[PDB]
Amino acid sequence: SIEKIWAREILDSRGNPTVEVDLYTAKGLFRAAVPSGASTGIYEALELRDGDKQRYLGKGVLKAVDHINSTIAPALISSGLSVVEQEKLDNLMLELDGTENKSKFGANAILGVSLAVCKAGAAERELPLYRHIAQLAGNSDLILPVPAFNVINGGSHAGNKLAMQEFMILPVGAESFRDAMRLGAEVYHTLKGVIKDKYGKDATNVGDEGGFAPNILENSEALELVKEAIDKAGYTEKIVIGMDVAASEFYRDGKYDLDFKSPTDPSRYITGDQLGALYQDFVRDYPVVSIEDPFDQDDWAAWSKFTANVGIQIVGDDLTVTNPKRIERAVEEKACNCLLLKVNQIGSVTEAIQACKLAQENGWGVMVSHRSGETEDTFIADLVVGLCTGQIKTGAPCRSERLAKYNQLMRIEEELGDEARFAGHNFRNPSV
Amino acid sequence: SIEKIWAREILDSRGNPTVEVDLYTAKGLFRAAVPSGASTGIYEALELRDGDKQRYLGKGVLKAVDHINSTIAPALISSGLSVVEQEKLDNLMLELDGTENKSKFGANAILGVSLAVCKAGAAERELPLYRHIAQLAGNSDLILPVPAFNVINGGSHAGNKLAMQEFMILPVGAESFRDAMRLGAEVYHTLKGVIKDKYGKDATNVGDEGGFAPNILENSEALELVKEAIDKAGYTEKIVIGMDVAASEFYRDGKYDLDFKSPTDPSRYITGDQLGALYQDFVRDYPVVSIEDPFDQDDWAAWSKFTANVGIQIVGDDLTVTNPKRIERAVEEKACNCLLLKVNQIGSVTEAIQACKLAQENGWGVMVSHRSGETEDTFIADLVVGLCTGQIKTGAPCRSERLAKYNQLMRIEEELGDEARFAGHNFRNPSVL
Ligand SMILES: O=C(O)[C@@H](CO)OP(=O)(O)O
Ligand SMILES: [Mg+2]
Ligand SMILES: [Mg+2]
């Protein structure tokens, strides 16, 4: 059984408070921390913040910490449930909170415990975390994912005019995970120079996920820079491009604003059909293989129309919010063909594994993902391997809240030895 | 004794390879990783890189890793020494390398093992790492440091004209280390809004150590932004400013170039005296209480002259390179009055502890430091507590290679409970608390 659970406030990678949990058993100390998004979908489970405007500008998580220390911890300790009983412990927390969207304690309170339980369970099973997660998921094979590195940061938060949120490179042609890390780092550093040469040193600073933030508007120009960097690095045949549009961030009155970081003007708005047309031009003209959140989280018609008219991967993120109820709707409507898996969109390990299994049972891809606000935690590296999903996005190869996960993937690949497989060109459907 | 060692290449916070070491004993696996400078002084111990242009543009560390796996590991396993014997183990590595600047194995090979041994040592003692380090250093009475947060980045750490490398805020008036984190983070977020309002959103992306990289040239304007954010956040009485000029980065034909990232124009260069006059203006106009590397690493007369004419902290970094030989010279010449402590400038835990003790025995301060290429490793958080130095700089409160250290210092303060003491206004001299 659990001996002690103790939560505290730490700072995430943007310097804002988040929840960390230490959980002790007879095997020792197991620590986990909770990420935080910026372009957060409206259907995400509640992140509970303090709202004390005097303290961290309203962003403290003392309330969430206290729900853990004062309520969750003594309930789980008193139950006597072993930390191997992931589903019992997560369901107990869901029923203690009593709400559908985890608005009484916060999804941040519940998930920091859920993650720490999962780590403690692995140790009780005498397994590495990724193997424990595979057994929780009913997986046998393990597979290293292709990494998707966000190298030109844009969007709502980005320090530039670029509307679309992320321009990713995916080393599908690499020989192994460690090789994919080299391809991604070499293209990233090459891109820094392409940018410096074209825009000047001012353009070579980084945004929240470590990608460059150049002073550009046109989404085709981001794509051109990325393609130019892949070519100059010598990897044209081995690296392709993925996009996170995050279109909920620029939906306005039924249309979409591709210059929304400028001062409001409805004449510049385009329709979802216009937007779909732009994406078809990007797929023809650039090596784009995957587009995430091409339309707003509620614009079901545009998603299903677009998904039926293209062969690329279409990834639900704000549309699906790692939520089996929304995933069922997107399967019924054929809205997309891959789930972005963010444990803190739903708020427990058991529910995120259920979401992943639902997506895979219906033939979709699953890409595990960080949040833009991350920590030194590396849980998601073990999670992507244990779920055998074949694809992860967890930052540029820059800023160690991103590298901590990529370096852990390299350790997992080393540990698997001859048994290590790399998803490579089968990143969408690794089960083959 | 050590059961097994296994080193590998990981990526640092800039996406460049660096050394990580796993060391195994009866108590389990202990892991450490090595940081890497950009503005590196000419006298630092050798960072061994592979030079294979086909692989990470020559920046691989496979040679350092193989020296660990194939030569240093059986040497230390054969010794049979317990991992608690830091000094015997580090001396075994220094003798086996047998060079002054660690150019046979690389300082990055020797340090990676040195740090892993220290972590394994603490577990064998059943002590937290900061307690084991205090024992290594002969300290009994631990203190949490004031953090020095580099919230505007310039020089070799950022895409801007700004020549001076670091503009830091120190919450000397905080109540505790947790409170100093809240003050630092609130000023940093406030500063984002100050810069955005003045320079636009394009000025609020960050440099290598998580400070904002605004498109400005004047160092006085960086100080003005920082002081404005301090005031707007409401902490004028509790937060003061430190600088790392890193002047070796812009020393050019005997002069100093404050626009060194713009195409070469020697007509703009200023003299050592002119640069010293500018610092006097900063110290009078702004609450600057510490200046690091004000002159080039070999411009000894300018350092001595400036130090004698101010009453603030003057920190050697490239001047001293965590190196007892250079620190003795700096004491003899009164070049500075505080040591920047970087484990990888010298290459072993034992030597860094000796450098720290030598500075403190001479009445200097010691400020423990990260490198601008960091990892998710948190050793230096326990090191600054164990060494009782009173001051650490390890980034803006932004990028988790920075926050991992700050978060660990919060955990250490919580663990110490009612025994915790925060250095506050005694950051230069905490032994008095
Ligand atoms: O000069 C310095 O003090 C350091 C740390 O901030 O930078 P670098 O590691 O690049 O030398
Ligand atoms: Mg989002
Ligand atoms: Mg998204």
Ligand SMILES: [Mg+2]
């Ligand atoms: Mg330097």
Ligand SMILES: [Mg+2]
């Ligand atoms: Mg310095």
